Amino acid sequence: TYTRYQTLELEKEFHTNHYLTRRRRIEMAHALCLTERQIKIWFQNRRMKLKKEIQAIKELNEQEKQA
Ligand SMILES: [Cl-]
Ligand SMILES: [Cl-]
């Protein structure tokens, strides 16, 4: 799972940049005390979450622009 601090810090980083470099993933890994894999998955899932939020709004705006 992910602690209150890990979540807050992962979100802070995510908003700065959705994609990380291998060097950055390492930095994050040591800082948040999560493995490279735990960071890699979190970022993939957080991108998946965003992709869905963007689509939901896109289709809400298409819906609300009728009649
Ligand atoms: Cl906690
Ligand atoms: Cl990553």
Side-chain angles (χ1 to χ4, degrees), residues 7-63:
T7 300
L8 173 130
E9 285 297 326
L10 281 156
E11 282 289 4
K12 200 172 126 196
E13 195 56 28
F14 179 77
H15 289 110
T16 313
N17 39 46
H18 304 165
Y19 299 93
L20 303 182
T21 60
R22 182 207 145 88
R23 182 53 71 221
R24 194 50 166 166
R25 184 190 307 128
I26 303 275
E27 279 167 28
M28 291 306 292
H30 296 310
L32 309 192
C33 299
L34 286 162
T35 70
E36 261 203 85
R37 202 203 170 238
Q38 295 183 285
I39 277 136
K40 191 146 178 176
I41 289 156
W42 192 95
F43 268 76
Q44 279 171 6
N45 295 336
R46 188 62 188 87
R47 268 177 233 128
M48 192 33 77
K49 191 191 185 288
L50 193 60
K51 199 174 99 181
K52 309 280 192 185
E53 293 177 298
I54 281 152
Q55 175 64 19
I57 289 146
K58 176 194 176 282
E59 68 184 281
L60 259 164
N61 279 323
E62 291 168 343
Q63 186 190 36

Short mmCIF file of all heavy atoms in Angstrom, two decimals, residues 7-63:
data_model
loop_
_atom_site.label_atom_id
_atom_site.label_comp_id
_atom_site.label_asym_id
_atom_site.label_seq_id
_atom_site.Cartn_x
_atom_site.Cartn_y
_atom_site.Cartn_z
N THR A 7 1.80 9.12 -0.86
CA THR A 7 0.72 9.57 -1.74
C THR A 7 0.85 11.06 -2.07
O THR A 7 0.76 11.44 -3.24
CB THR A 7 -0.66 9.24 -1.11
OG1 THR A 7 -0.79 7.83 -0.91
CG2 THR A 7 -1.82 9.76 -1.93
N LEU A 8 1.06 11.90 -1.03
CA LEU A 8 1.19 13.35 -1.17
C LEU A 8 2.38 13.72 -2.05
O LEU A 8 2.30 14.66 -2.84
CB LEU A 8 1.34 13.98 0.23
CG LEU A 8 1.65 15.47 0.31
CD1 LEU A 8 0.70 16.15 1.26
CD2 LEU A 8 3.11 15.72 0.71
N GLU A 9 3.48 12.98 -1.89
CA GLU A 9 4.71 13.25 -2.61
C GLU A 9 4.67 12.75 -4.00
O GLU A 9 5.25 13.37 -4.88
CB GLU A 9 5.93 12.72 -1.86
CG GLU A 9 6.31 13.57 -0.66
CD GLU A 9 6.75 14.99 -0.94
OE1 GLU A 9 7.38 15.23 -2.00
OE2 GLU A 9 6.45 15.87 -0.10
N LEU A 10 3.98 11.62 -4.22
CA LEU A 10 3.83 11.03 -5.54
C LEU A 10 2.94 11.94 -6.37
O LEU A 10 3.31 12.25 -7.50
CB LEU A 10 3.27 9.61 -5.46
CG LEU A 10 4.27 8.51 -5.08
CD1 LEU A 10 3.56 7.32 -4.46
CD2 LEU A 10 5.16 8.10 -6.27
N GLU A 11 1.84 12.47 -5.78
CA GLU A 11 0.92 13.42 -6.41
C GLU A 11 1.59 14.74 -6.77
O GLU A 11 1.40 15.24 -7.87
CB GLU A 11 -0.33 13.67 -5.55
CG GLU A 11 -1.37 12.56 -5.64
CD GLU A 11 -2.18 12.39 -6.92
OE1 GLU A 11 -1.92 13.12 -7.91
OE2 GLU A 11 -3.07 11.51 -6.93
N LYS A 12 2.39 15.27 -5.86
CA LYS A 12 3.16 16.49 -6.04
C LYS A 12 4.05 16.30 -7.29
O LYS A 12 3.93 17.08 -8.23
CB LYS A 12 3.98 16.77 -4.75
CG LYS A 12 4.47 18.19 -4.55
CD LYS A 12 5.09 18.33 -3.17
CE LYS A 12 6.50 18.89 -3.19
NZ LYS A 12 7.20 18.68 -1.89
N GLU A 13 4.85 15.21 -7.34
CA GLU A 13 5.72 14.87 -8.48
C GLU A 13 4.91 14.68 -9.76
O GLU A 13 5.31 15.20 -10.79
CB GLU A 13 6.57 13.61 -8.20
CG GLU A 13 7.74 13.36 -9.15
CD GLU A 13 8.79 14.46 -9.33
OE1 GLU A 13 9.01 15.25 -8.38
OE2 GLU A 13 9.41 14.49 -10.41
N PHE A 14 3.78 13.92 -9.69
CA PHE A 14 2.93 13.65 -10.84
C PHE A 14 2.46 14.92 -11.51
O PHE A 14 2.50 15.01 -12.74
CB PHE A 14 1.73 12.76 -10.48
CG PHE A 14 0.82 12.48 -11.67
CD1 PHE A 14 1.18 11.55 -12.63
CD2 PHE A 14 -0.38 13.16 -11.82
CE1 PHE A 14 0.35 11.30 -13.72
CE2 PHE A 14 -1.20 12.93 -12.93
CZ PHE A 14 -0.83 12.00 -13.87
N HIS A 15 2.05 15.92 -10.73
CA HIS A 15 1.55 17.17 -11.30
C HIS A 15 2.67 17.97 -11.97
O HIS A 15 2.43 18.52 -13.05
CB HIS A 15 0.73 17.94 -10.27
CG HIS A 15 -0.59 17.24 -10.02
ND1 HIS A 15 -0.86 16.60 -8.81
CD2 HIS A 15 -1.60 16.97 -10.88
CE1 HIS A 15 -2.04 16.02 -8.97
NE2 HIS A 15 -2.53 16.21 -10.20
N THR A 16 3.90 17.89 -11.45
CA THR A 16 5.08 18.50 -12.05
C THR A 16 5.41 17.85 -13.42
O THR A 16 5.72 18.56 -14.38
CB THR A 16 6.29 18.39 -11.09
OG1 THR A 16 5.91 18.77 -9.77
CG2 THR A 16 7.47 19.19 -11.55
N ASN A 17 5.36 16.50 -13.49
CA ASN A 17 5.64 15.67 -14.67
C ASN A 17 4.96 14.28 -14.60
O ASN A 17 5.20 13.52 -13.65
CB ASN A 17 7.16 15.54 -14.95
CG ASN A 17 8.04 15.39 -13.74
OD1 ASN A 17 7.75 14.60 -12.83
ND2 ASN A 17 9.13 16.13 -13.71
N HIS A 18 4.12 13.96 -15.60
CA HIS A 18 3.42 12.68 -15.66
C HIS A 18 4.36 11.52 -15.98
O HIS A 18 4.09 10.40 -15.57
CB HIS A 18 2.26 12.73 -16.67
CG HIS A 18 1.27 13.84 -16.40
ND1 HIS A 18 0.35 14.23 -17.36
CD2 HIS A 18 1.09 14.60 -15.29
CE1 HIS A 18 -0.34 15.21 -16.81
NE2 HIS A 18 0.08 15.48 -15.57
N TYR A 19 5.47 11.80 -16.67
CA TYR A 19 6.46 10.79 -17.02
C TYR A 19 7.76 11.04 -16.29
O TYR A 19 8.20 12.18 -16.19
CB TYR A 19 6.65 10.70 -18.55
CG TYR A 19 5.38 10.32 -19.28
CD1 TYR A 19 4.53 11.29 -19.79
CD2 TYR A 19 5.00 8.98 -19.41
CE1 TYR A 19 3.33 10.95 -20.43
CE2 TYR A 19 3.81 8.63 -20.05
CZ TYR A 19 2.97 9.62 -20.54
OH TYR A 19 1.80 9.25 -21.17
N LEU A 20 8.36 9.97 -15.77
CA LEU A 20 9.63 10.08 -15.07
C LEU A 20 10.75 9.43 -15.88
O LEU A 20 10.49 8.50 -16.66
CB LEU A 20 9.57 9.38 -13.71
CG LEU A 20 8.52 9.81 -12.68
CD1 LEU A 20 8.71 9.01 -11.42
CD2 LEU A 20 8.56 11.30 -12.40
N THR A 21 12.01 9.89 -15.68
CA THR A 21 13.18 9.28 -16.29
C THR A 21 13.62 8.18 -15.33
O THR A 21 13.19 8.19 -14.17
CB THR A 21 14.30 10.30 -16.51
OG1 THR A 21 14.69 10.87 -15.27
CG2 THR A 21 13.91 11.38 -17.49
N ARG A 22 14.45 7.23 -15.78
CA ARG A 22 14.92 6.17 -14.89
C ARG A 22 15.63 6.81 -13.69
O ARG A 22 15.37 6.40 -12.57
CB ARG A 22 15.81 5.16 -15.63
CG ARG A 22 16.29 3.99 -14.73
CD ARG A 22 17.61 3.39 -15.19
NE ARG A 22 18.44 2.94 -14.07
CZ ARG A 22 18.38 1.74 -13.50
NH1 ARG A 22 17.48 0.84 -13.91
NH2 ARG A 22 19.19 1.42 -12.50
N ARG A 23 16.49 7.85 -13.93
CA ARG A 23 17.21 8.56 -12.87
C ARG A 23 16.23 9.13 -11.84
O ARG A 23 16.39 8.86 -10.64
CB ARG A 23 18.15 9.65 -13.44
CG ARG A 23 18.99 10.43 -12.41
CD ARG A 23 19.82 9.57 -11.46
NE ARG A 23 20.96 8.91 -12.12
CZ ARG A 23 21.34 7.66 -11.89
NH1 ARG A 23 20.68 6.90 -11.03
NH2 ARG A 23 22.39 7.15 -12.54
N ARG A 24 15.18 9.83 -12.31
CA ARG A 24 14.15 10.38 -11.44
C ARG A 24 13.40 9.31 -10.64
O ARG A 24 13.22 9.52 -9.45
CB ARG A 24 13.17 11.29 -12.20
CG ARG A 24 12.29 12.15 -11.29
CD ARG A 24 13.07 12.91 -10.22
NE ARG A 24 12.26 13.96 -9.61
CZ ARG A 24 12.56 14.60 -8.49
NH1 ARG A 24 13.66 14.28 -7.81
NH2 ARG A 24 11.77 15.55 -8.03
N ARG A 25 13.01 8.18 -11.27
CA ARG A 25 12.33 7.06 -10.59
C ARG A 25 13.19 6.57 -9.42
O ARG A 25 12.65 6.32 -8.34
CB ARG A 25 12.04 5.93 -11.59
CG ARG A 25 11.24 4.74 -11.03
CD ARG A 25 11.18 3.55 -11.97
NE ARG A 25 10.70 3.93 -13.30
CZ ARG A 25 11.33 3.64 -14.43
NH1 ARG A 25 12.45 2.92 -14.41
NH2 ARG A 25 10.84 4.05 -15.59
N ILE A 26 14.54 6.49 -9.61
CA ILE A 26 15.52 6.10 -8.58
C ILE A 26 15.45 7.10 -7.43
O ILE A 26 15.25 6.68 -6.30
CB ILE A 26 16.97 5.94 -9.13
CG1 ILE A 26 17.08 4.91 -10.31
CG2 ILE A 26 17.98 5.63 -8.02
CD1 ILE A 26 17.23 3.49 -9.99
N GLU A 27 15.60 8.41 -7.73
CA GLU A 27 15.54 9.50 -6.74
C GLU A 27 14.30 9.38 -5.86
O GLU A 27 14.42 9.32 -4.62
CB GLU A 27 15.60 10.87 -7.44
CG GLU A 27 17.01 11.28 -7.82
CD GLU A 27 17.17 12.45 -8.77
OE1 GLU A 27 16.28 13.33 -8.80
OE2 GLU A 27 18.20 12.48 -9.48
N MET A 28 13.15 9.23 -6.51
CA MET A 28 11.82 9.04 -5.92
C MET A 28 11.82 7.81 -5.03
O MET A 28 11.31 7.87 -3.92
CB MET A 28 10.77 8.85 -7.05
CG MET A 28 10.49 10.08 -7.90
SD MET A 28 10.04 11.50 -6.89
CE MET A 28 8.44 10.98 -6.26
N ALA A 29 12.39 6.69 -5.54
CA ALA A 29 12.47 5.41 -4.83
C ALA A 29 13.16 5.54 -3.49
O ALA A 29 12.60 5.11 -2.48
CB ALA A 29 13.18 4.38 -5.70
N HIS A 30 14.33 6.20 -3.48
CA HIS A 30 15.12 6.42 -2.27
C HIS A 30 14.48 7.45 -1.34
O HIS A 30 14.59 7.30 -0.13
CB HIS A 30 16.56 6.81 -2.62
CG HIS A 30 17.33 5.73 -3.33
ND1 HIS A 30 17.37 4.43 -2.84
CD2 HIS A 30 18.09 5.80 -4.44
CE1 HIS A 30 18.11 3.75 -3.70
NE2 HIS A 30 18.57 4.53 -4.67
N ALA A 31 13.84 8.49 -1.90
CA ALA A 31 13.21 9.56 -1.12
C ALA A 31 11.97 9.10 -0.37
O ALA A 31 11.82 9.42 0.81
CB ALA A 31 12.86 10.72 -2.02
N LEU A 32 11.08 8.38 -1.06
CA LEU A 32 9.80 7.89 -0.54
C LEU A 32 9.89 6.49 0.05
O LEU A 32 8.89 5.99 0.59
CB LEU A 32 8.72 7.95 -1.65
CG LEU A 32 8.53 9.25 -2.42
CD1 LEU A 32 7.30 9.20 -3.22
CD2 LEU A 32 8.44 10.46 -1.49
N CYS A 33 11.07 5.85 -0.03
CA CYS A 33 11.32 4.48 0.48
C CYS A 33 10.30 3.46 -0.11
O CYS A 33 9.67 2.68 0.61
CB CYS A 33 11.40 4.43 2.01
SG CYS A 33 12.72 5.43 2.73
N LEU A 34 10.16 3.51 -1.45
CA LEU A 34 9.32 2.65 -2.31
C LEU A 34 10.26 2.13 -3.37
O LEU A 34 11.13 2.88 -3.79
CB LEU A 34 8.26 3.49 -3.06
CG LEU A 34 7.06 4.01 -2.29
CD1 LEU A 34 6.42 5.12 -3.05
CD2 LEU A 34 6.05 2.87 -1.98
N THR A 35 10.06 0.90 -3.86
CA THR A 35 10.95 0.41 -4.92
C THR A 35 10.68 1.13 -6.26
O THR A 35 9.66 1.80 -6.42
CB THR A 35 10.77 -1.09 -5.12
OG1 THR A 35 9.49 -1.32 -5.70
CG2 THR A 35 10.93 -1.87 -3.85
N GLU A 36 11.60 0.98 -7.21
CA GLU A 36 11.49 1.48 -8.58
C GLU A 36 10.16 0.97 -9.19
O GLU A 36 9.45 1.74 -9.81
CB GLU A 36 12.64 0.93 -9.43
CG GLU A 36 13.83 1.84 -9.65
CD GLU A 36 14.60 1.43 -10.90
OE1 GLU A 36 14.21 1.88 -12.01
OE2 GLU A 36 15.55 0.63 -10.78
N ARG A 37 9.83 -0.33 -8.96
CA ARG A 37 8.59 -0.99 -9.43
C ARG A 37 7.34 -0.35 -8.80
O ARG A 37 6.39 -0.05 -9.52
CB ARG A 37 8.63 -2.50 -9.15
CG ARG A 37 7.70 -3.32 -10.04
CD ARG A 37 7.33 -4.66 -9.42
NE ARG A 37 6.25 -5.32 -10.16
CZ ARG A 37 5.08 -5.68 -9.64
NH1 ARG A 37 4.82 -5.47 -8.35
NH2 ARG A 37 4.16 -6.25 -10.41
N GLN A 38 7.36 -0.11 -7.47
CA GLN A 38 6.25 0.52 -6.75
C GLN A 38 5.97 1.92 -7.28
O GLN A 38 4.81 2.32 -7.39
CB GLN A 38 6.53 0.56 -5.25
CG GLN A 38 6.59 -0.81 -4.61
CD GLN A 38 6.79 -0.70 -3.14
OE1 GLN A 38 7.88 -0.39 -2.65
NE2 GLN A 38 5.71 -0.95 -2.41
N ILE A 39 7.04 2.66 -7.65
CA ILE A 39 6.94 3.99 -8.26
C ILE A 39 6.45 3.89 -9.69
O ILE A 39 5.56 4.67 -10.06
CB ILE A 39 8.26 4.80 -8.11
CG1 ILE A 39 8.28 5.47 -6.73
CG2 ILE A 39 8.40 5.88 -9.20
CD1 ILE A 39 9.40 5.38 -6.12
N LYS A 40 6.99 2.94 -10.49
CA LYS A 40 6.66 2.71 -11.90
C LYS A 40 5.17 2.41 -12.09
O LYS A 40 4.56 3.01 -12.98
CB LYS A 40 7.55 1.61 -12.53
CG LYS A 40 7.45 1.50 -14.05
CD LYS A 40 8.78 1.09 -14.68
CE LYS A 40 8.69 0.94 -16.19
NZ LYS A 40 10.01 0.62 -16.81
N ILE A 41 4.61 1.52 -11.23
CA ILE A 41 3.20 1.09 -11.22
C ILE A 41 2.32 2.27 -10.81
O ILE A 41 1.30 2.51 -11.47
CB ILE A 41 2.98 -0.14 -10.29
CG1 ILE A 41 3.59 -1.41 -10.87
CG2 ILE A 41 1.51 -0.38 -9.95
CD1 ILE A 41 3.91 -2.43 -9.81
N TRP A 42 2.67 2.97 -9.71
CA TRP A 42 1.89 4.11 -9.22
C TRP A 42 1.67 5.13 -10.35
O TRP A 42 0.52 5.50 -10.60
CB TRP A 42 2.54 4.76 -7.99
CG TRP A 42 1.64 5.74 -7.29
CD1 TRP A 42 0.83 5.49 -6.22
CD2 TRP A 42 1.43 7.12 -7.65
NE1 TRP A 42 0.13 6.63 -5.88
CE2 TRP A 42 0.47 7.64 -6.75
CE3 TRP A 42 1.93 7.95 -8.66
CZ2 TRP A 42 0.02 8.96 -6.82
CZ3 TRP A 42 1.47 9.26 -8.74
CH2 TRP A 42 0.53 9.75 -7.83
N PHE A 43 2.75 5.51 -11.05
CA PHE A 43 2.73 6.44 -12.19
C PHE A 43 1.92 5.94 -13.37
O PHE A 43 1.28 6.75 -14.04
CB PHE A 43 4.15 6.83 -12.62
CG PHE A 43 4.63 8.09 -11.93
CD1 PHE A 43 5.05 8.05 -10.60
CD2 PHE A 43 4.57 9.32 -12.57
CE1 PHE A 43 5.43 9.23 -9.94
CE2 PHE A 43 4.98 10.48 -11.92
CZ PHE A 43 5.42 10.42 -10.61
N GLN A 44 1.92 4.62 -13.62
CA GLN A 44 1.14 4.02 -14.70
C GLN A 44 -0.34 4.11 -14.33
O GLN A 44 -1.14 4.54 -15.15
CB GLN A 44 1.53 2.56 -14.95
CG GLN A 44 2.78 2.40 -15.82
CD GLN A 44 3.29 0.97 -15.89
OE1 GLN A 44 2.68 0.01 -15.39
NE2 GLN A 44 4.45 0.80 -16.52
N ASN A 45 -0.69 3.72 -13.08
CA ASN A 45 -2.06 3.77 -12.56
C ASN A 45 -2.60 5.20 -12.49
O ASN A 45 -3.76 5.41 -12.86
CB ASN A 45 -2.19 3.06 -11.20
CG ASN A 45 -1.95 1.55 -11.22
OD1 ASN A 45 -2.11 0.86 -12.24
ND2 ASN A 45 -1.62 0.98 -10.07
N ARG A 46 -1.76 6.18 -12.08
CA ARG A 46 -2.12 7.61 -11.98
C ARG A 46 -2.36 8.23 -13.34
O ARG A 46 -3.17 9.15 -13.46
CB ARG A 46 -1.07 8.40 -11.21
CG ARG A 46 -1.46 9.83 -10.89
CD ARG A 46 -2.67 9.98 -10.01
NE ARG A 46 -3.08 11.38 -9.89
CZ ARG A 46 -3.89 12.00 -10.74
NH1 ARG A 46 -4.40 11.35 -11.78
NH2 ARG A 46 -4.20 13.27 -10.56
N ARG A 47 -1.67 7.71 -14.38
CA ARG A 47 -1.86 8.15 -15.76
C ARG A 47 -3.19 7.58 -16.28
O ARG A 47 -3.95 8.28 -16.94
CB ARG A 47 -0.69 7.69 -16.63
CG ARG A 47 0.40 8.73 -16.74
CD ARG A 47 1.53 8.16 -17.56
NE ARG A 47 2.78 8.28 -16.81
CZ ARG A 47 3.63 7.29 -16.58
NH1 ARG A 47 3.41 6.09 -17.10
NH2 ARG A 47 4.72 7.51 -15.86
N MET A 48 -3.47 6.31 -15.93
CA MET A 48 -4.69 5.59 -16.26
C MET A 48 -5.88 6.35 -15.68
O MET A 48 -6.85 6.58 -16.40
CB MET A 48 -4.63 4.14 -15.74
CG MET A 48 -5.73 3.24 -16.27
SD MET A 48 -6.26 3.63 -17.98
CE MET A 48 -4.86 2.90 -18.95
N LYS A 49 -5.77 6.81 -14.41
CA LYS A 49 -6.77 7.60 -13.69
C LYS A 49 -7.05 8.91 -14.43
O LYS A 49 -8.21 9.23 -14.69
CB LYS A 49 -6.31 7.85 -12.24
CG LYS A 49 -7.37 8.41 -11.31
CD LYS A 49 -6.77 8.88 -9.97
CE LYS A 49 -7.81 9.33 -8.97
NZ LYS A 49 -8.42 10.64 -9.34
N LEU A 50 -5.99 9.64 -14.82
CA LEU A 50 -6.09 10.89 -15.56
C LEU A 50 -6.73 10.71 -16.92
O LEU A 50 -7.60 11.50 -17.28
CB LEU A 50 -4.71 11.54 -15.71
CG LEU A 50 -4.67 12.99 -16.20
CD1 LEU A 50 -5.42 13.91 -15.25
CD2 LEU A 50 -3.25 13.46 -16.35
N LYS A 51 -6.32 9.65 -17.68
CA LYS A 51 -6.84 9.36 -19.02
C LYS A 51 -8.37 9.22 -18.98
O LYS A 51 -9.06 9.78 -19.84
CB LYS A 51 -6.16 8.13 -19.64
CG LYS A 51 -6.33 8.05 -21.16
CD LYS A 51 -5.54 6.91 -21.82
CE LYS A 51 -6.38 5.70 -22.13
NZ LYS A 51 -5.58 4.61 -22.76
N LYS A 52 -8.89 8.55 -17.92
CA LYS A 52 -10.33 8.35 -17.67
C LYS A 52 -11.02 9.66 -17.29
O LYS A 52 -12.09 9.92 -17.82
CB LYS A 52 -10.60 7.26 -16.60
CG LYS A 52 -9.90 5.91 -16.79
CD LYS A 52 -10.54 4.97 -17.79
CE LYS A 52 -9.97 3.57 -17.69
NZ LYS A 52 -10.50 2.67 -18.75
N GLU A 53 -10.41 10.49 -16.37
CA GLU A 53 -10.98 11.79 -15.95
C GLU A 53 -11.13 12.75 -17.16
O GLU A 53 -12.20 13.35 -17.32
CB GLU A 53 -10.15 12.47 -14.85
CG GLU A 53 -10.13 11.77 -13.50
CD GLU A 53 -9.24 12.42 -12.44
OE1 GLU A 53 -8.00 12.51 -12.64
OE2 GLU A 53 -9.79 12.80 -11.38
N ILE A 54 -10.07 12.84 -18.02
CA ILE A 54 -10.08 13.64 -19.26
C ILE A 54 -11.22 13.20 -20.21
O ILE A 54 -11.99 14.05 -20.68
CB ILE A 54 -8.69 13.62 -19.93
CG1 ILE A 54 -7.74 14.59 -19.22
CG2 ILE A 54 -8.76 13.91 -21.44
CD1 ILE A 54 -6.36 14.21 -19.29
N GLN A 55 -11.34 11.88 -20.47
CA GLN A 55 -12.39 11.31 -21.32
C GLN A 55 -13.79 11.62 -20.75
O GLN A 55 -14.64 12.10 -21.50
CB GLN A 55 -12.16 9.81 -21.56
CG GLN A 55 -13.27 9.07 -22.34
CD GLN A 55 -13.46 9.52 -23.77
OE1 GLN A 55 -12.59 10.14 -24.40
NE2 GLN A 55 -14.63 9.20 -24.34
N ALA A 56 -14.02 11.39 -19.43
CA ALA A 56 -15.29 11.67 -18.75
C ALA A 56 -15.77 13.13 -18.97
O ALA A 56 -16.93 13.34 -19.34
CB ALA A 56 -15.14 11.39 -17.26
N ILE A 57 -14.86 14.11 -18.81
CA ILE A 57 -15.14 15.53 -19.02
C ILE A 57 -15.41 15.79 -20.50
O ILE A 57 -16.40 16.45 -20.83
CB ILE A 57 -13.99 16.42 -18.46
CG1 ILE A 57 -14.00 16.40 -16.93
CG2 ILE A 57 -14.08 17.87 -18.98
CD1 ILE A 57 -12.73 16.48 -16.37
N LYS A 58 -14.54 15.26 -21.40
CA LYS A 58 -14.68 15.39 -22.85
C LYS A 58 -16.08 14.98 -23.26
O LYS A 58 -16.73 15.75 -23.97
CB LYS A 58 -13.62 14.54 -23.60
CG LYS A 58 -13.76 14.55 -25.14
CD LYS A 58 -12.94 13.46 -25.83
CE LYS A 58 -13.15 13.37 -27.34
NZ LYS A 58 -14.42 12.68 -27.71
N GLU A 59 -16.56 13.81 -22.77
CA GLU A 59 -17.89 13.32 -23.11
C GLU A 59 -18.99 14.02 -22.30
O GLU A 59 -20.12 14.04 -22.78
CB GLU A 59 -18.00 11.79 -23.09
CG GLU A 59 -17.89 11.07 -21.76
CD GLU A 59 -17.93 9.56 -21.92
OE1 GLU A 59 -19.05 9.01 -22.09
OE2 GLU A 59 -16.85 8.93 -21.94
N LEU A 60 -18.68 14.67 -21.16
CA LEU A 60 -19.68 15.46 -20.40
C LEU A 60 -19.98 16.74 -21.17
O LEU A 60 -21.11 17.22 -21.17
CB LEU A 60 -19.12 15.88 -19.03
CG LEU A 60 -19.53 15.11 -17.80
CD1 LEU A 60 -18.59 15.44 -16.66
CD2 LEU A 60 -20.94 15.44 -17.39
N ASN A 61 -18.93 17.33 -21.77
CA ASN A 61 -18.98 18.56 -22.55
C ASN A 61 -19.67 18.38 -23.88
O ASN A 61 -20.30 19.33 -24.36
CB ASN A 61 -17.58 19.16 -22.70
CG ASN A 61 -17.12 19.94 -21.49
OD1 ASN A 61 -17.90 20.64 -20.82
ND2 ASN A 61 -15.84 19.87 -21.20
N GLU A 62 -19.56 17.18 -24.48
CA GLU A 62 -20.23 16.82 -25.74
C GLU A 62 -21.74 16.63 -25.46
O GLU A 62 -22.57 17.10 -26.24
CB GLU A 62 -19.61 15.55 -26.35
CG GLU A 62 -18.19 15.75 -26.88
CD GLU A 62 -17.38 14.52 -27.26
OE1 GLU A 62 -17.74 13.40 -26.84
OE2 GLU A 62 -16.35 14.70 -27.95
N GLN A 63 -22.07 16.00 -24.31
CA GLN A 63 -23.42 15.75 -23.81
C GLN A 63 -24.15 17.08 -23.53
O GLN A 63 -25.22 17.32 -24.09
CB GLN A 63 -23.35 14.88 -22.53
CG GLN A 63 -24.71 14.41 -21.99
CD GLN A 63 -24.66 13.76 -20.61
OE1 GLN A 63 -23.89 14.14 -19.72
NE2 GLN A 63 -25.56 12.80 -20.39
#
